[PDB]
Amino acid sequence: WDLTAFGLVAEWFLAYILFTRFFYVLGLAAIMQLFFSYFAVHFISNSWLM
Amino acid sequence: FMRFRRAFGEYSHVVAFNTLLFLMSFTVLCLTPVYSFLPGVYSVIYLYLT
Amino acid sequence: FYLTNDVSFLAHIQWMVMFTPLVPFWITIAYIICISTKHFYWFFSNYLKR
Amino acid sequence: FPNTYLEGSVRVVTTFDSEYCRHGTCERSEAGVCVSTSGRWVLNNDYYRSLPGVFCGVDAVNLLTNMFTPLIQPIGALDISASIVAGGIVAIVVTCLAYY
């Protein structure tokens, strides 16, 4: 069987248990990374910095 | 390894040019599927520079 | 050209970050060639000339 | 179908202002002259003057002048063919400066 997802969930739960002020930036980075996977191509043109 | 390092200096001069030539040839090959007139001109200029 | 390398690197980085998205392509290519001229001679002398 | 000036690997097509169509779907195209490096279908309509290897213009001189349009475009317009475009400017610049 495969239990990688369960391990990731357990690690996230333990991270949530160890709450600090710096958890919010990690959460924002994770949610931005998840969000950019779906739209992506819709608003990327020119501006090589972007 | 030391003997090979000592011997490799003689042909390093050829290798340095051949590596860049291979890169140029690979780029030309990569550009083929659009401009299907390049290979002849590239062969002509290759023979000229030879 | 009339500056120390310590501030020259910062100036080049700032110019690359700032003016890039609103300048013609050939101007950027000329700038890159001009800034990279002094290394091509060294590379050619040390690994291609012989 | 529009008139064809050449046929084969290299194709040159001149079109009027009409909805040229064949077996399949139909689109409207402006009058002008089009040329493609491949034997693929070509039109003066939008979405056709974006594909690589396709050149278009109002007339013969206009097409030749517009062939250099991407050269003044800001960086970030080509992905694979950027190397040859860069080299074609680098060689001219280095020669015209360093010698003359």
UniProtKB/Swiss-Prot annotation, chain B:
Membrane topology classification: Multi-pass membrane protein
Where in the cell? Host endoplasmic reticulum membrane
Q: Which residues cross the membrane?
A: 37-50
- Phenotype for T27I: In strain: Omicron/BA.2, Omicron/BA.2.12.1, Omicron/BA.2.75, Omicron/BA.4, Omicron/BA.5, Omicron/BQ.1.1, Omicron/XBB.1.5, Omicron/EG.5.1
Give me the Cytoplasmic side stretches, as residue ranges. Answer: 3-36
Self-association and partners: Interacts with PL-PRO and nsp6.
Give the function comment from the record: Plays a role in the formation and maintenance of double membrane vesicles (DMVs) replication organelles. DMVs are formed by nsp3 and nsp4, while nsp6 zippers ER membranes and connects to lipid droplets.
- Name of protein: Non-structural protein 4
User: What organism does this protein naturally occur in?
Assistant: Severe acute respiratory syndrome coronavirus 2
**Protein's gene:** rep
Part of the whole protein covered: 3064 to 3113 of 7096
Swiss-Prot record, chain C:
TM region(s), chain numbering = 15-35
The listed locations are: Host endoplasmic reticulum membrane
Q: Which domain of life is it from?
A: Viruses
- What does the annotation give as the result of altering A30V? In strain: Omicron/EG.5.1
List the ranges whose topology is Lumenal: 8-14
Membrane topology reported for the UniProt record: Multi-pass membrane protein
* Annotated function: Plays a role in the formation and maintenance of double membrane vesicles (DMVs) replication organelles. DMVs are formed by nsp3 and nsp4, while nsp6 zippers ER membranes and connects to lipid droplets.
Can you state the subunit structure given in the record?
A: Interacts with PL-PRO and nsp6.
Protein name as annotated? Non-structural protein 4
Q: Which residues of the whole protein are included?
A: 3114 to 3163 of 7096
